[PDB]
């Protein structure tokens, strides 16, 4: 993880702007549609299109990612409670983290076509993989 990657990630996530919750909800919808095996972690959720529960969950995930961007240098300490939750309480398979990272990348590519240069793509992929690694570190 390099400082150039950190700068590129901060720039891309800043140009994401206040649409972070919308991006998170769309990424979750994409993950549910593309990989239905991930829907089993949300049995109490309304997983239809436009669902308010999915909107709130996407807002929460996007806020977590904003905190991670704000604390790229201290990710394990910033995401400690989330790693504990996702590894102990939920016991999420580590492959679904890759699936959600891919869907987040697809949402970013579809909503920021100009910013999604190959270098920014690589930087964002490294950032999301590090957040996934941190969240799966309790295994």
């Amino acid at each position: 993880l390099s400082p150039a990657d950190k700068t590129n990630v901060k720039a891309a996530w800043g140009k994401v702007g206040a649409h972070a919750g919308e991006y998170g909800a769309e990424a979750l919808e994409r993950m549910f549609l593309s990989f239905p095996t991930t829907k089993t972690y949300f049995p109490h959720f309304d997983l239809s299109h436009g669902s308010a529960q999915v909107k709130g969950h996407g807002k929460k995930v996007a806020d977590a990612l904003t905190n991670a961007v704000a604390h790229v240098d201290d990710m394990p300490n910033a995401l400690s409670a989330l790693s504990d939750l996702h590894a102990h309480k939920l016991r999420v398979d580590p492959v679904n983290f890759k699936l959600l990272s891919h869907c987040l990348l697809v949402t970013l590519a579809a909503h920021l076509p100009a910013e999604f240069t190959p270098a920014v793509h690589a930087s964002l992929d490294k950032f999301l993989a590090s957040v996934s690694t941190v969240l799966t570190s309790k295994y």
Partner: protein
């Protein structure tokens, strides 16, 4: 297994895909984002920087060939295993490529399609194309099965 509506959406989106560029940028983005894949493309010249990878004529031509293979797989979605038998032999017996890199390249292609189509690419369109790329990767990885 794709429904008729999914197949129609997939074909409609593939109709507006630039066959001279999209495969090249997909291959280049694979080389940049997963740089261990550059070990299979040593004879392609300079690959040190993203600009060097995305400005490489060898990468462009090979990506064009890969995109043609993807298009042929799209034209025989029900015969993917038979369409990619020779390519599966080529990649497994001689190249020794790991089948996970096929998934990586398919996902990079999906990201490239999203980056071009934008709003026109939709979560259902992404679901259909994820099905397509998973099928292509499975067919190409059959010789390991």
């Amino acid at each position: 297994h794709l429904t008729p509506e999914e197949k129609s959406a997939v074909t409609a989106l593939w109709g507006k895909v630039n066959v001279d560029e999209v495969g090249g940028e997909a291959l280049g983005r694979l080389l940049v984002v997963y740089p261990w894949t550059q070990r299979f493309f040593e004879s392609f010249g300079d690959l040190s920087t993203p600009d060097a990878v995305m400005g490489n004529p060898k990468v462009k031509a090979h990506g064009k060939k890969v995109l043609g293979a993807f298009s042929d797989g799209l034209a025989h979605l029900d015969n993917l295993k038979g369409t990619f038998a020779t390519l599966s032999e080529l990649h497994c017996d001689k190249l020794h490529v790991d089948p996970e890199n096929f998934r990586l390249l398919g996902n990079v292609l999906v990201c490239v399609l999203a980056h071009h189509f934008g709003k026109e690419f939709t979560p259902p369109v992404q679901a259909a194309y994820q099905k397509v790329v998973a099928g292509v990767a499975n067919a190409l990885a059959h010789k390991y099965h």
